[PDB]
């Protein structure tokens, strides 16, 4: 049921800018989205994404591996967006019972307070909303109007625009802050900036801070995420459980984005007025455009709905972190017996979860890993396992298991998953222990030769090779094929060529000091500062198990590869032409 006082001007305006077209189609296939017309539009997107030829050039043995190769195939065109639509975002969470509401209303109000004790919440300029824009991803969309995002900032027509939304949203209104579709949803630049401006404090000001938070990894990387883990692992307790939500976005309730809402009420003047229309007008009341292929040629559809989450946001990332904890400590009191029933929670339950939460609430915190939608938790004992009636009502369904079947957790923190990778101990030749991230092997290479952009130059094509290159060299460099790999694209693109997108794989500097950076001198789990002289001294993982996370180095087709490797990194060299290239080979 759609509230158009608040969505009708959107939805006027898309009208009346598309009047002689305009109808409600009745075959519309939206069951659980509010459906209120369409008009004729022109197809966008592909049904392919493009290939980085430099890193196919270098990794011939995977061009037969079905996982590798179906990475390639994305399909944005309108038949490729209903799909996705169709399978995951046309679904219905209902609403949580009263007592879970309550759980959810005291907790949240309780995490905000922690959030805020250090913190103070605070207005994003246009100045570091610039500054942002002349780096890479904002997540606009750019349509029929500017060229780039680089090119609408300098514009002074641009702000004036971003004015009259932002005096509107100061009366409580909205106009032009709508979904695209193009599952990720975008925004016009100008409605990202106003979301920015008032949420971006979340990230800018780090309030998923593991120090803020507790429970959070924001700003953490991936060579500190494992030592995270096996800190969690030394707590008393319980087994360490890892549970996936299916389809977490979708899964956010319109109770949820009111809780997250409740750090307006840490805001003073017109920043909580202006983050007060963010939450009520474009999270809470969403309009939605998404392409739609029928037998007359593309129509853009006009949907509506209240309590999704759109991915690709400027808090989704905050808020999805805040809404697990939340989700995980509640889970965490129904193991421990905190209440007792979710369809309402008595007096004298309410005092008590109260109570818990100041008595050990910060302590529980501690005992997670939360990135967004993926959590690790070691609780108190293993009824953590089967305290399942507030996740359930909730929404946050697990993944991959009936509904009422308990958790299973481990027992060893080297079998975690957590942000898709495990985490294993390395013995250098020292004596010295590197924790070291380790993923499929096929997952990595898949998307090295995937290219972001479509038309992009040859050097471009080669500098985002370089990229993974060197985060291969600095992240995966325990794994005999990736560091072979990485060499070989280090020396097949000309040594001072930058790499394309803050990480530390950014920059032209030697690998090797950038490794005895991260790994020794700037590691606070690294007693011993002294570094490494050589790539020779840094290890690999054992042959038997490196193979394991997805290696070829026993096959036919790799030992082949190795050989002949300077054959191709020659021919890939060819083409760039008449350079200076480094070799990095042994
Ligand atoms: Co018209
Ligand atoms: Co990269
Ligand atoms: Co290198
Ligand atoms: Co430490
Ligand atoms: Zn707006």
């Known amino acids: 049921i759609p509230n158009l006082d608040i969505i009708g001007k959107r939805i006027e305006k898309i009208k009346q800018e598309h009047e002689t077209s305009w109808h409600y189609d009745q075959d519309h296939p939206y069951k659980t989205w509010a459906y209120h017309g369409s008009y004729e539009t022109k197809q966008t997107g592909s049904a392919s994404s493009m290939v980085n030829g ?20 994305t399909d944005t065109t309108p038949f490729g967006q209903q799909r996705v639509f169709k399978e995951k975002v046309d679904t219905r969470t209902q609403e949580p019972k009263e007592g879970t509401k309550k ?29 942002k824009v002349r780096s890479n991803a904002a997540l606009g969309a750019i349509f ?43 925004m016009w630049l100008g409605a990202r900036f106003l979301e920015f ?42 087994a ?12 956010i309730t319109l109770e949820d984005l009111k809780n997250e809402e409740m750090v307006t009420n840490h ?4 920043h909580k007025k202006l983050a ?22 593309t129509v853009m559809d006009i949907i509506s709905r209240r309590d999704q989450r759109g991915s690709g946001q400027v808090g989704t990332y905050g808020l999805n972190t805040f809404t697990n904890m939340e989700a995980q400590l509640i889970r965490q009191m129904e193991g421990e017996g905190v209440f007792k029933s979710i369809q309402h929670l008595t007096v004298t339950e309410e005092i008590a979860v109260q109570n818990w939460l100041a008595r050990v609430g910060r302590e529980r915190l501690s005992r997670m890993a939360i990135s967004g939608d993926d959590c690790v938790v070691k609780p108190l004992d293993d009824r953590f396992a089967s305290a399942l009636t507030a996740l359930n009502d909730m929404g946050k369904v697990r993944k991959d298991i009936q509904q009422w079947e308990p958790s299973r957790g481990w027992n060893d923190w080297t079998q975690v998953p957590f942000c898709s990778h495990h985490f294993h101990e390395l013995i250098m030749k020292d004596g010295r222990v590197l924790v070291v991230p380790c993923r499929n092997q096929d997952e990595l290479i898949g998307r090295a030769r995937i290219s972001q952009g479509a038309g992009w130059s040859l050097r471009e094509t080669a500098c985002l090779g370089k990229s993974y290159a060197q985060m291969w060299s600095l992240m995966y460099f325990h794994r005999r094929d990736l ?61 038997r198990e490196d193979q394991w996370c997805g290696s070829l180095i026993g096959l036919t087709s790799r030992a082949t590869w190795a050989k002949n490797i300077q054959t191709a990194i020659n021919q890939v060299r060819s083409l760039i032409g008449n350079e200076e290239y480094t070799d990095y080979m042994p």
Request: charge should be negative; aromatic fraction near 10%; hydrophobic fraction near 35%.
């Open 276 to 297: 007060e229309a963010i939450f009520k007008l474009t999270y809470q009341n969403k309009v939605v455009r998404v392409q739609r292929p029928t037998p007359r040629g």
């Open 197 to 238: 401006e008032a949420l971006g404090f979340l990230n800018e000001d780090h309030w998923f801070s593991r120090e803020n938070s507790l429970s959070g990894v924001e700003g953490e990387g991936l060579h500190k995420l494992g030592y995270i883990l096996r800190d969690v692992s030394k707590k008393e307790g319980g």
């Open 144 to 186: 029929t109007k500017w060229k780039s995002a680089r090119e609408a900032v300098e514009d002074s027509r641009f702000w004036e625009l971003v004015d009259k939304e932002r005096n509107l949203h100061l009366e409580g209104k909205c106009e032009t802050c709508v979904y695209n579709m193009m599952a990720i949803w975008y």
């Open 240 to 251: 360490m459980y890892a549970d996936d939500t299916a389809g977490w976005d979708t899964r």
């Open 54 to 73: 430099v890193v196919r050039l270098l990794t011939k043995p995977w061009d037969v591996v079905p996982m590798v190769t179906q990475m390639a195939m």
């Open 103 to 131: 759980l959810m209303k005291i907790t949240a109000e309780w995490l905000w307070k922690e959030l805020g004790k250090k913190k103070t919440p605070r207005m994003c300029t246009r100045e570091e909303f610039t500054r």
């Open 483 to 543: 560091r072979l790999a990485a060499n070989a694209i280090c020396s097949a693109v000309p040594s001072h060529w930058v790499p394309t997108s803050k990480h530390e794989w950014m920059t032209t500097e030697d690998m090797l000091t950038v490794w005895n950076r991260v790994w020794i001198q700037e590691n606070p789990w690294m007693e011993d500062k002294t570094p490494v002289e050589s790539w020779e001294e840094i290890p690999y993982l054992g042959k």
């Open 267 to 270: 805001m003073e003047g017109e």
